[PDB]
Structures are given as structure tokens and as C-alpha cells.
């Protein structure tokens, strides 16, 4: 249709699980055709990104051909998009064109890698050589962020501390899921007395490398109910099980840092845009929504994220984690979820983080809240509507979309 | 705006020009700007594809950073895609939706390589590595083409010497462009004498390894005309030289083909599917077309091409090639470009194929002949129409563009 929904969800566990980045992507498109009724039959697109464990030219062919998507008796579409982290959401984008334009009734949208069975060494090379040119010292991507981080330190007076507080409020919903890659929530001192990796950002502020694959099934309500609306979920908790795609939107900037301090500028910046038209679009505001998945590489990354989207105005991102720090402290040391509906996973700090995968987390955790299969994560009231957030390179990517369970 | 054209059109040399992938593609947006009578801060979105002889994250953000499109105060989207040699037209498709979808007011779209300069070595190992899983012996792409190319011999009755045909006709055409690599035409003969590679391929057979890039610049016509349409050429070719984007479609099939022959089947190719849905969505049909920009990797590919668009029956492309070369040596011999108007810049075959640059080299072609700039190749009366279609991987990806100066 023109309204577009998500209506299969597919995934791996999280990890080190000893598979190839195609054995991923193949278990988790079984997974999402299962959980949308489907079969490989019913599928007429397919979009992926690239993997850093596995660099394949034109991946999302390679994936469908090993997969054993081929041969077949219709028309079938295959893309491959890199956006960085951004990615995701990106090809969640482009399969509503796909559907919009009818070139596709039903498309899946795959990220898959093993950035963790890889090795430290070997993911430090290929990560590091991500970023030549840029004049960044290794490890280049923290490095990156951390530059951001400073910038913010003297531009706007953010705190060490402020940053620190990110991984704390990470680890405390991370706990709440027994998938998550951080079981044991850390402290402000463990943070801070964590080793420095850069400057002001130290190793458990960095991003928790993991393996794992998310395929989506991205299809229109009318198509998918003619021909596949069989199961009797109640239709409570069946909207946000397979929610409408209200809208996406992106925006960009530049690869790396300029490397000066005094030619960082504020239009770098890209997600505020994004988040700008993906409301636009969806003719909602940030009032309407009730859960937020978060781009959180880096403590930087998910401070800017708050005041992008609309929670907390420019320059104040810190002192929101701040609030939310001190509520913990302030209530038995008990992150309550309806007071910071964000990253009730653990995000890419605390969850897990496969390079290019794990906006989809973002995404896959919106619906377990929407559906109310959340569990000890669970928003009350139920949101009905939720944004998801991916952030590629460094600061170079955005993607916002937003989910609805109902219109 | 409704109408949607390529305003801008900018391209290095081509050859040997041992230059980096960055100077290469920085020069040809340069042109390409010039040429539009736009400057940098006129884009507002970039599409690029990925390089072999220098592969880079995140590659069209990393040009983008390099060659100083950041900072903006505006939105800027980019992205990379990567549907192999299919890439420059599948990326336009996108462009267009870009601007149809109002994301984008401007959009540009590279694709750069060096793969001569990069080395003989270098080239056939990664060339080789992209097909990894196959299962196909070295040089990996050949292989898999000449299989396809076996198999339409014993299902359609195609002949040895009609492949070889292909690469004199494009030497034909080439002789007449002075930036074609190849100057001297081939003798059919001459072709089957070459080294072989594979069974039914042979040397002068295989694509032209070249360094080069060429950048287009896509924007709605209603928008470009009030901001940049300044100068006082003539209004004829000035629908050329500037065409409106009739249509793009897109399918796509395996990375590469079976471990046996004869479970392959008409419907692996996607080059009917994508011209079909062209055709449909331009609403023309094949003799509509004066000027045909097809992709010609190997003679296989021309061959199942000019079936597939409908300039011959099903199994008729290699006689169709065969009268072409009859009917010249009956008349000198001399390639008459209004007897068989395609690829009249000499193609992969003998212009020169930069890996996922070159359909960029059949809009470039196709804007040169309905513009009336095309010399010694141009046709006349001057087309009206044009239609381009690039490849990607083994008959992995088809995009189909139809191309027309005016409504």
C-alpha cells in the first residue's frame, strides 16, 4: 500500500556464536519468514549492508545466492547500501520505496557480521584502515568520537563524568535482558577507572563488539492481509508486533573530524534533520512518541541523539543523562524505565553492537515495547508509537525512522 | 518536480592515468558542476559506488569528506550502492526517487575506478576473490559468463564465431571514438586467434581494464530551470545534452551461476525483466529506441541484451550479430551506426570498462548522440530516445534507463 508495515522480524542470538556472517543472515531470514507466516516464495526484494568480518562485493547478492534464494519464478530486486550504522534503518527506507513504487509487495532487509569471532587484531586493522585519510591516531574510530567529545567539553562545558554516566545507564537496562552482552551493570568509578582508550573516553564507554544477524520483512497491510493474515494474535499487541512504518528519513556529513579543533562546526551534524522530516512525514511530534532507540556507539553519540530528537534542548544532553543518574541513585539504584524510555535493551553500549547490525536492536526492541513483549523492560503505559535512530561513520550518517502500532 | 533530468554530466580521460580514485572522482564532480551551472553548495545529495583499485568505508561519504562537500548548513544525504556494474543506473533510479520524494532537491552520482592503474596481479585477485563460493575456477567472472554463454549455444543454437563478432563491432565503433582505447577495429578472425581465458572466451573478448570516472548530476526540471538554467544554446539539444530520465527498473538474479548447466533457465535473466518494466513504466516500446547503451562485459551479455530489450527474438542475438557483421564486410568493411545503433563509443569491449564505472560511458554516449554531438558516430535523424543498461556481477543485477530530450 502507501502505508507500509514491518511485518516480519527475524533474529540471531548475540555474541560469539561461532557461525559465518552467511550462516547469520540465512538463520535469521528463517527466523523473520516464520514470524510473518511466509516462505521464500513471498519475498520480491532484498536489501543489506556490508560486513567488516566479511567484505564481499555486492553482499546482498552473495547473501540471497548462498542462502538458496534462487532460483525463482518472479520478479526480485537486490540491493546493497552502506551508510555505516546508519544502514538499517536506511534500507528500512528504501523497501517502503520499493512497496510505494510497487516494485516490491514484500521485501527483506538483512545486516549480518562477526566482528567478534573475528579477533581483536584483525577488527582493529580493518576497522583502523575504515578510516585512512582521516589523520586520526588508532584505535581511529574512538579516536574520532573522542575528538567530538572534547570539542564539547570546551564548546558547550560537558563533563567527563557526564560521559561516563552513559555506560551506567546502558548496564542498568542491559541487566533487565538476558540477551544483552553486559550482565553486570558497571559502576560510575568502574567507568571512570576504566582504561583510557582516548582522552576522555575510556574502554567501557566504548562500543561491546558482538556477532549477530536481523533480517526484517518490510510489506503492505492490505497485500499481507489478503494472502497472509491467518494467525490469531489478538489484534492488541498484533499492531506493534507488526508495526507501521510512519516514516524515514536521513541526513549527512563528513567522514572524519577536519582535524582542527577550531574548524569543528555545528552543521557537521546531521540527526536533528532527519529526526525533523521523519516527524514531518508521519505528521507526529516527539510528544507522541514513548520509546526511543538511540545510536549509542560512543557516550557523544548518544548525547547529541537526546537533544536531536527532541527530549532535551541543544547543549543540555549531559546534564539529562545527569538527571537520570542521580533519579537512579535517587530510587534504590533502579533505572526506571518510564522516567528514561531509552535503549531499555542496553544499546550498542550494553546489548551488543555487530558493526553495521545493531540499529536493528533499536528497531527490534521498539516493537518488543509496542507489543508489550517487553518483559522486565516493559514501558507502562504501552507507547504506541516509537523512534529508532542509527548514526554511521562518525557523525557522517543519520537515519530516523518511526514506528506506530496503529494509525 | 514531476520531470526529472540529468542536468549535469562531467568524466575524466580514460586509461592509464595514475591517479588516485579521489582525484579521479573529485575531477569528473568538478565537470560535472561546470557543466550544470551549479557549484557546491547547489548539491544537496551524493550517490557513489565502490571502488576496486582503492575500496574505502563508507566510499561516497569518504569522496564527499575529501573533496570538501562538508561543512553544509543544509541537508546533504549520502549514500553508497552497490549493485555491481548495474550500479551507475540503479543509483540514478534512486537519485530520481530522491527528488520525487522531495529528500533531495540535487542529487549527484559517481562511480570512479583505476583498475589498470592498480596492476595486473592486484586486479585479478580481487576481481577473483568478489566471487568467492562460486565454485568458479580463475579468472572467476569469465568463467561464469562463458558458462551462460555455453549454455545459450545448446538451448538457442548460438555459434562460437557470433561471440567473437561482438568485440569486432564494438572495435568498429570504438575506431571512430578518439578516447576509445581501442583505435584499430578487430577482424573476426583476429579475435579467435587472442589467448584464451575460457572455452568460449577469448582475450579481445573480455572487458578493457581503465581508470576513470564520471559524475551525473540529477534535479527536477521545473527546480533547475528558474535556479541554473542559464545560456543561450539552442533549445533543441538542450532537451539533449540535459534528458529527462523516462523511466529506470531494476532485477536481479544469482552472484553467479550452478555447479551443472542444465538447471539453468530463462528466467535467470533480468535484463527482459528490468527493460520489460521500463518499457511499461515509459510506456514505448523497442522501436521506439534510436540509440541503445548496452552493457557488454562479454559478448554473451550483448548478445542476451539485445534479445532481452527486444531489437531481436529470443535466441536470435549471436545471428543478430552475424547479419551486422555480413552486412558490413558486403560494404567495405564499414560499421553504419543506423544498421546497428549501439554502444557507438566502443563499449566495455573496446572503450574501456573502469569495474562498476562504465554504464556511466552509455549515458554519457547516449546524451552525446541526442544532443547531435557524437561526430562520426552520430546518428541521424537525431534520436529522441535512448535506452541504457548496465550489469551487474554474473546476470546479478539489470538496471534499464530510458532516456528522452523532451515530452
Not at 580493518?126 to 582521516?134: G, I
Not at 574510530?141 to 551506567?168: C, F, N, T
Not at 574502554?203 to 491467518?230: K, M, N, T
Amino acid at each position: 500500500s502507501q502505508v507500509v508495515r514491518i511485518v516480519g522480524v527475524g533474529r540471531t542470538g548475540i555474541g560469539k556464536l561461532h557461525k559465518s556472517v552467511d550462516e547469520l543472515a540465512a538463520s535469521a531470514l528463517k527466523c523473520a519468514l516464520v514470524d510473518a507466516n511466509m516462505k521464500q516464495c513471498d519475498l520480491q526484494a532484498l536489501i543489506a549492508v556490508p560486513s567488516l568480518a566479511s567484505p564481499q562485493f555486492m553482499q546482498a547478492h552473495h547473501i540471497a545466492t548462498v542462502a538458496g534464494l534462487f532460483p525463482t519464478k518472479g520478479k526480485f530486486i537486490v540491493r546493497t547500501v552502506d551508510t555505516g550504522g546508519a544502514g538499517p534503518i536506511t534500507a528500512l527506507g528504501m523497501a517502503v520505496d520499493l512497496v510505494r513504487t510497487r516494485c516490491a509487495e514484500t521485501v527483506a532487509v538483512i545486516a549480518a557480521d562477526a566482528v567478534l569471532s573475528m579477533g581483536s587484531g584483525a577488527f582493529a586493522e580493518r576497522s583502523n584502515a575504515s578510516l585512512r585519510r582521516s589523520g586520526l591516531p588508532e584505535p581511529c574510530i574512538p579516536h574520532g568520537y573522542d575528538r567530538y567529545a572534547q570539542w564539547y567539553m570546551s564548546r558547550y562545558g560537558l563533563k567527563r563524568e557526564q560521559l561516563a554516566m552513559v555506560p551506567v545507564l546502558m548496564s542498568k537496562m542491559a541487566e533487565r535482558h538476558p540477551e544483552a552482552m553486559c550482565q553486570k551493570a558497571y559502576t560510575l568509578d568502574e567507568v571512570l577507572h576504566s582504561r583510557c582508550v582516548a582522552p576522555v573516553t575510556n574502554l567501557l564507554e566504548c562500543a561491546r563488539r558482538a556477532d549477530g544477524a536481523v533480517a526484517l520483512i518490510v510489506s503492505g497491510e492490505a497485500h499481507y492481509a489478503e494472502h497472509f493474515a491467518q494467525g490469531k494474535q489478538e489484534q492488541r499487541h498484533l499492531g506493534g508486533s507488526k508495526p507501521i512504518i510512519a516514516s524515514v528519513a536521513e541526513a549527512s556529513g563528513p567522514l572524519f573530524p577536519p582535524g582542527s579543533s577550531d574548524d569543528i562546526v555545528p552543521d557537521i551534524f546531521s540527526c536533528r534533520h532527519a529526526a525533523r522530516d521523519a516527524f514531518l512525514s508521519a505528521n507526529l511530534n516527539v510528544g507522541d512518541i514513548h520509546f526511543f532507540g538511540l545510536y549509542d556507539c560512543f557516550p557523544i553519540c548518544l548525547i547529541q541523539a537526546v537533544e536531536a530528537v527532541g527530549l532535551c534542548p541543544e547543549g543540555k544532553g549531559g546534564e539529562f543523562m545527569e538527571t537520570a543518574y542521580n533519579e537512579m541513585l535517587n530510587n534504590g539504584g533502579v533505572l526506571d524505565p518510564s522516567k528514561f524510555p531509552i535503549n531499555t535493551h542496553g544499546g550498542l553500549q550494553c546489548f551488543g553492537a555487530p558493526w553495521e547490525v545493531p540499529a536493528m536492536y533499536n528497531i527490534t526492541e521498539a516493537i518488543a515495547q509496542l507489543s508489550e513483549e517487553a518483559g522486565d523492560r516493559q514501558l507502562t503505559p504501552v507507547p504506541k508509537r516509537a523512534l529508532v535512530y542509527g548514526n554511521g561513520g562518525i557523525f557522517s550518517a543519520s537515519s530516523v525512522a518511526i514506528l506506530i502500532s496503529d494509525l
